[PDB]
Amino acid sequence: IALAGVGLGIGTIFGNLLVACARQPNLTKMLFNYAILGFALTEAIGLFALMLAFLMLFS
Amino acid sequence: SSWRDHGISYLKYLNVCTETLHSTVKESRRAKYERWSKPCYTAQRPDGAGGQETIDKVPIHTKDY
Amino acid sequence: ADRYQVIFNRFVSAGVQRNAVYNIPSYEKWKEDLADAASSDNQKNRYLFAN
Amino acid sequence: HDLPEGFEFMEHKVVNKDIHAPHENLETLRLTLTRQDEFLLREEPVKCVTVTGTNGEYGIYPGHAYKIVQLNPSPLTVEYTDGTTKKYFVSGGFAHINNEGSCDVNTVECTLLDDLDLAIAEKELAAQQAALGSAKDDKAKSVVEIRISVIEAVIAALKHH
């Protein structure tokens, strides 16, 4: 269930990203890099939850 | 607010606001400010007889809006 | 109307009165140019203004 | 044959900051207050300027984000770094805010709040209220409503201080 708050978060980021890219087309690279950074940071939490699930499923 | 629905443009709204603001000015200063709102412009076309046919494309005064 | 060209006299000094022009394009053309400036790297001086 | 453009005779251009540039901490805002192709302040350094836009009030300080504001009949306050406040009243116009530290407020009419009087506004408001009932048609009603709103804003500005 933790992943529910992870995937949604990713969407949020990308959501805002599009809006930003709409009003600053010439600053797309930095926005995309920051969006990737945020996605990886959230994926860290996702992997923590996944590791707990695997520990409780395979042991 | 409600003037847009009636077709009144933004420029006429500005003119009305300025005229009201000038009307709210003190007696002493108004002599200057009133010179920036008094309508003194007209539209004319020369006819065959020479008379300056006046046009009604746009109202001149605010009360005519 | 495609545009509205205003031609007047510019008073540079007491003895110099040149002729100057103000060009006022149609709302559609102005919108197109504004969008191009906002999106494309061209018209870099109006980028912030258009956006 | 190539006619000039009237903008070539004006050398006080607008400085727009580039996207990929370092940030600067500014302590003053260059204000440019204009009425009918006439300025009252020429790039005056001020601490802040308060302008009443359509959506609501805006308090502009140095470094404010690039923006366009459609003003409404209302007071406009200018506070200098010294600690002195100067209050005007505007009937309409636009305010262009630049991230480089400039604010150009172009109004159709910008007059000192002191120049305005109270009793004059009250009597004009009463006359407009009386004429509203006798409005010829919908357009006259809207025009009278516009005038009444302007007068009410003026009276509120005066009574505030």
Q: What share of chain B is helix, strand, coil (3-state, %, to 5)?
A: 40, 10, 50
CA dist D124 → D1, D75, D98 (Å): 54, 19, 38
Name the residue among D14, B11, D62, D53 with its Cα closest to residue C49: D14
D28 and D96 within one domain: yes
When divided into structural domains, chain D yields a total of 2
Is D1 a member of any domain?
Answer: no
Chains touching chain C, criterion 3+ CB pairs below 8 Å:
A, D
Distance from CA of D67 to the nearest CA of C (A): 8
- Give me the residue from C20, C49, C51 closest to D5, CB to CB: C20
D142 and D111 within one domain: no
D75 and D153 within one domain: no
D106 and D40 within one domain: yes
Contact list, C47 vs chain A (CB under 8 Å): 26
D86 and D27 within one domain: yes
Q: Is A47 annotated as a binding residue?
A: no
Question: How far, in Å, CA of A57 to CA of A52, rounded?
Answer: 9
B50: left (phi over 0), alpha (psi -120 to 50) or beta: left
Is D148 a member of any domain?
Answer: yes
Answer for the pair C3, D5: CB distance below 8 angstroms, yes or no: no
Is D8 a member of any domain?
Answer: no
Distance from CA of A15 to the nearest CA of C (A): 19
Q: The domain containing residue B10 runs over which residues?
A: 1-65
Of D116, D136, D153, the position where a domain reaches its end is D116
Question: How far, in Å, CA of A55 to CA of B14, rounded?
Answer: 71
Question: How far, in Å, CA of B58 to CA of D113, rounded?
Answer: 33
Pairwise CB contact (< 8 Å): B16 & D147: yes
Which of D142, D144, D158 to probe the B interface (max B CBs under 10 A)? D142
D128 and D80 within one domain: no
Question: How far, in Å, CA of D140 to CA of C13, rounded?
Answer: 46
D58 and D28 within one domain: yes
D19: nearest CA partner in chain A: A27
**CB contact set of D112 (below 8 Å; sequence gap of 6+):** D87, D88, D89
Structure tokens at D128: 């407009």
Distance from CA of A24 to the nearest CA of C (A): 8
**CB contact set of D105 (below 8 Å; sequence gap of 6+):** D31, D32, D33, D34, D49, D51, D71, D76, D90, D93, D94, D95
Classify residue D144 as exposed, middle or buried by CB count within 10 Å of its CB (0-12, 13-18, 19+): buried
SS3 D133: helix
Is D12 a member of any domain?
Answer: no
Residue D82 CB neighbours (<10 A): 7
D64 and D51 within one domain: yes
Classify residue B23 as exposed, middle or buried by CB count within 10 Å of its CB (0-12, 13-18, 19+): buried
In DSSP notation, A18-55 reads HHHHHH-GGGHHHHHHHHHHHHHHHHHHHHHHHHHHHH
A27: nearest CA partner in chain D: D19
Q: Which residue has the tokens 């406040």?
A: D85
E strand or H helix that includes residue D159: helix D138-160
Looking at residue A4, what DSSP letter applies? H
* Phi, psi values for residue A40, rounded to 5°: -65, -40
D135 and D105 within one domain: no
SS3 D116: strand
Question: How far, in Å, CA of D149 to CA of B3, rounded?
Answer: 12
- Give me the residue from D93, D120, D140 closest to B24, CB to CB: D120
D27 and D102 within one domain: yes
Question: How far, in Å, CA of B38 to CA of C47, rounded?
Answer: 40
Residue-wise over D35-74: b if at least 16 C-beta within 10 A, else e? beeebbbeebebbbbbbbbeeeebebbbebeeeebebbbb
Q: What is the distance, to the nearest Å, from the Cα of residue D77 to the centroid of all Cα atoms in its chain?
A: 9
Contact list, D20 vs chain A (CB under 8 Å): 27
A22: nearest CA partner in chain C: C39
Pairwise CB contact (< 8 Å): C41 & A26: yes
D81 and D151 within one domain: no
Chains touching chain A, criterion 3+ CB pairs below 8 Å:
C, D
Structure tokens at B17: 């606001």
Name the residue among C22, A6, B57 with its Cα closest to residue D10: C22
Question: How far, in Å, CA of D7 to CA of C8, rounded?
Answer: 12
Q: The domain containing residue D149 runs over which residues?
A: 117-161
Is D84 a member of any domain?
Answer: yes
D155 and D83 within one domain: no
When divided into structural domains, chain B yields a total of 1
